[PDB]
């Protein structure tokens, strides 16, 4: 009932979109933080059904590696959408170049992905373009991930579609999206996570897109492993993402059996 | 918005 700014105060723009912008807004009675996606509903027409789709996608999110959703408001032609701030910032801030992290650091985040992302596939969800950018740190470091601007229900009551868009970023998309006409949902993230574990392990992606065409995609396929980002990964962690990197998508690896993987349940000292 | 249709699955 009150205009916005009056209730919030803007303190900084954290990213910009064609959509939009995202601002850390500080709430002036509460002192409470909250991100808040601004959308400009004059901009295209799907602009409608897009937001429609993607606030009730954020209604069905409740876990604590998922970015909470508190609510949506509309002033004029402006939506917005509040959520919960991360002031850690990207992972992909975390990640030094050709290095990565500690093994670790890098485990705890991949322990708290895979559940956030076997969260979404249980409840239907998929978010289609995982990558350090889309996976945000609160004040504890603890790993959400965001922007679900891109996810669709793939699943629902045990029912299933193959999904056909083409959509993500493309050093993290799995083969199947580029070689197939559909896919399955499920093993597309797994794959996106794969490279997510190989950029914290090395400090670097593998290739630049999962094609044939490409020489580091047909080097790894090629067991070429003494050669970069893989000389630098231990072989326990590398075990496992030889068994994530599949490129037979029937073959490739499902979460519950990385639940089982001998580096997955290590204990790792710090 | 239609869990049921699997939103864009229509
Ligand atoms: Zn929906």
């Known amino acids: 009932a009150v205009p916005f700014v009056e209730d919030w105060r803007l303190v900084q723009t954290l990213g910009e979109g064609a959509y939009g912008e995202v601002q850390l807004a500080v709430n002036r009675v509460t002192e409470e933080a909250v991100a808040v996606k601004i959308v400009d509903m004059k901009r295209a027409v799907d602009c409608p059904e897009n937001i429609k789709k993607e606030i009730c996608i954020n209604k069905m999110l409740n876990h604590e590696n998922v970015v909470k959703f508190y609510g949506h408001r509309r002033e004029g032609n402006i939506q917005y959408l509040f959520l919960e701030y991360c002031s850690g910032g990207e992972l992909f801030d975390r990640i030094e170049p050709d290095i990565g992290m500690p093994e670790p650091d890098a485990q705890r985040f991949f322990h708290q992905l895979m559940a956030g992302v076997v969260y979404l596939h249980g409840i239907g969800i998929t978010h289609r373009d995982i990558k350090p950018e889309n996976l945000l740190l609160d004040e504890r470091d603890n790993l959400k991930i965001s922007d679900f601007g891109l996810a669709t229900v793939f699943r629902y009551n045990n029912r299933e579609r193959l999904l056909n868009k083409m959509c993500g970023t493309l050093p993290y998309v799995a083969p199947e999206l580029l070689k197939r006409r559909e896919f399955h949902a499920e093993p597309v993230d797994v794959w996106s996570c794969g490279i997510v574990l190989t950029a914290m392990l090395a400090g670097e992606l593998p290739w630049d897109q999962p094609s044939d065409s490409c020489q580091e995609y047909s080097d790894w396929k090629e067991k070429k492993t003494y050669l970069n980002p893989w000389k630098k990964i231990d072989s326990a962690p590398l075990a496992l993402l030889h068994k994530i990197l599949v490129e037979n998508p029937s073959a490739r690896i499902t979460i519950p059996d990385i639940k089982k993987d001998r580096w997955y349940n290590k204990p790792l000292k710090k | ?10």
């Open chain 2, 1 to 10: 918005e239609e869990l049921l249709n699997l939103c864009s699955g229509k």
